[model samples]
Target: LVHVASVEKGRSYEDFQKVYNAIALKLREDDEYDNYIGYGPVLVRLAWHISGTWDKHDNTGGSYGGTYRFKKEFNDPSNAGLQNGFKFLEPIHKEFPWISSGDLFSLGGVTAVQEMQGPKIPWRCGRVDTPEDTTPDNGRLPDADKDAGYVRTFFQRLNMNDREVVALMGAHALGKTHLKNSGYEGGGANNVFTNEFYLNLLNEDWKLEKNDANNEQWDSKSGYMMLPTDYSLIQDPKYLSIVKEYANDQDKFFKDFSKAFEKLLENGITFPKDAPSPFIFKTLEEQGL
Candidate 1:
């Protein structure tokens, strides 16, 4: 199940950049969604959820297959509130129909992150779509109510080390959980992408409480919530040290996050050495958009 990089025929960075601009522009135009948090956060989450399916053992699921398009994956109870992100990408997919599902999904994330002023995630294309049968079953994604050991073990299935796991979770800085969506609510700055999640994790005085959904969650008057798994980072000394390191150094967090996120998207795919170098997309700021 090793997927090699297969660049879309006659497509290059400029082509993907065009698609990136489309997503970024639409994100700006669609600012009213979710009280001005915009589409950026959900788009990032969509990309992660799609790529999160990868199992390093057999490589059955991952962004490489783009199986999220299938109803089976779309309707997974775990994917409850992601339809909005899918709808946001619908027109983009329609316009650039040539882009593979995997590429579009992963690229949407890359675009969202860069537009939101996060780290640059180098992306390579070549995810051909697989049939619906290839979609991974539900419950493959991590449960928010888990412990440090569970978080560590869950990511192990995707071949993510503890450092990578912590780095990936740093994405929580951008998005808030919807109570209706995942029974969790509010965390960090719901719009901007920064190392603030780690900062909050280290500094916030969190109290364990049950949300309206009756699930145990850590809450702060700052209107932020930390899932049991998020709290695990501090509870476990090994993870706590890295959390402190990231909380202390934004540059270090950005650098490690860039690497970890790229790896997350590339998991289960085998890119040949001769494969084209990864693309470092210009931010809209850099392009003077």
Candidate 2:
């Protein structure tokens, strides 16, 4: 299906900023969530999961469709806990009724990252909601138990290269992978977005161990852990080099991650030649509320 970007009529930078502010404020107000880990990480996860459904071959599933609002996509076992992010945005959607599902979902992620002291992700809005029939079937997301080779091949389906794969997974630095939500459990969540995912991959003394779920996860005596996919970055020499670079340079990691994450969200749509430039939203701290 050929999807195109068509801006919500009469909406512009200021209007979307309002939406961003609302989400950011709620993120601040909801301090009790996920044991104070906050909503920012899950919002990012929601945005990625929605976009990650894209298959470059046919361009069938992606953030452009807004299909996660449908039951099948919402209930995707892969998307198990993302409903929290969706519910978090429920009020925002009611307030900004004109925004498309894809736009709101993607922008929530952009807002989350910035509010959490991460990079400024340039975001372009205009994902018109397609029919519920357009929702991609479940099982399109990446698995937690895979290795580097599998991660590489799996991301190729989303048209992501090694660097982009590594950059995007830096989000693992943000949230926990719950046993209930994703058969895989926590690696000791850190809501502050940073190059720590890379640092943990390279610096931690991880040991292979089985959790109560009967799944293998890399653990360290320091109380940190890594899913097999995350551990693969250090295991593969090619990925290891990039991991080392990110671990060593926070600025470089931020720049690369901003570019890569924006690309990941914008993958499946054709924007008009004269479409508005992507917007970089100011964080709540910048506004001095």
Candidate 3:
């Protein structure tokens, strides 16, 4: 009766792939949010916001533990519009009770990006849900009102290098700055997934404009909006070059974004060399799993 077993009996790759299919199907169904734009972009942004809080030095918080279910993390001001993403995942959670919240949340990010045709982000599973005390404090998210220096400083606390910071901000390509979310609006119009953030940077004749209520969000001749921090990417000589490169080639942006997004999600985890390569699951609506 003292025999030892070496194998694990949990959700396998095939099981997870089914879960991925379910989420992908829901994403296809929920295309009426934010003006028929679907749940893809905000879900990606939510995953980024949740994971972006990690700090490498002390390893206080990261996507390794999905704590957003708690009020403290849920109340984060930067997360104003993210409840839409949380509600979107509810039905999936109901269907698959065994999947950990951390895995589901992170996988949602990977699913969103890949389905939107952004990049193939490899994802792993192992995150277990922690207790209520694990929720990260407020103010860990970035401020849209700040400049490049502030953006650089803010990301340093999260242990992201300059290149990683730039790559993550490239996500601005997928979603717009909502006034209700950050007191800023009008960054990603057309709302189609692309490397248009860089194009908007180079081509838009941007002028500082206060909204009707007198809040500063840069307005363009094309009626687009860019947060001051977003506009600063072009204003700063160094960041402008990277922005220009992304504008010139969508493939390069996808490649860099894929690498950076994967890094962002894996923060604080110690992966063994034998760890399986991340699974790039296809959306259910993709015809074949």
The CA-based lDDT of model 1 is what?
A: 0.89
**Model 2: per-residue lDDT, tens digit, 177-281?**
788877776867778888888887777788999987899999998889898888888889989999988999999999999999999999999999999999989
Give lDDT tens digits, candidate 1, residues 1-289: 6677788898988998999999989998999998788999999999999999888788788899899999999999999989999999999999999999999999999999989999899999988898888989998898888899999989889888988988989988887888899888665457777899898888888999987888999988887888999999999999999999999999999999999999989988888887788999998789899
- TM-score versus the correct structure, for each prediction: 0.97, 0.98, 0.92
- Model 2: how far residue 147 lies from native, Å: 1.3
Query: Per-residue CA lDDT of candidate 3, range 69-136, in tens?
Result: 88989888878889999999989999988887878898899888877876778888777677888788
List ranges where model 2 is wrong by over 4 Å: none
lDDT of 3 at 206: 82
Clashing pairs in 2: 54-61
Model 1 alpha-carbon drift over 4 Å, by segment: none
Question: Residue 182 error for model 1, in Å?
Answer: 0.8
Off by over 4 Å in 3: 1-9, 284-286
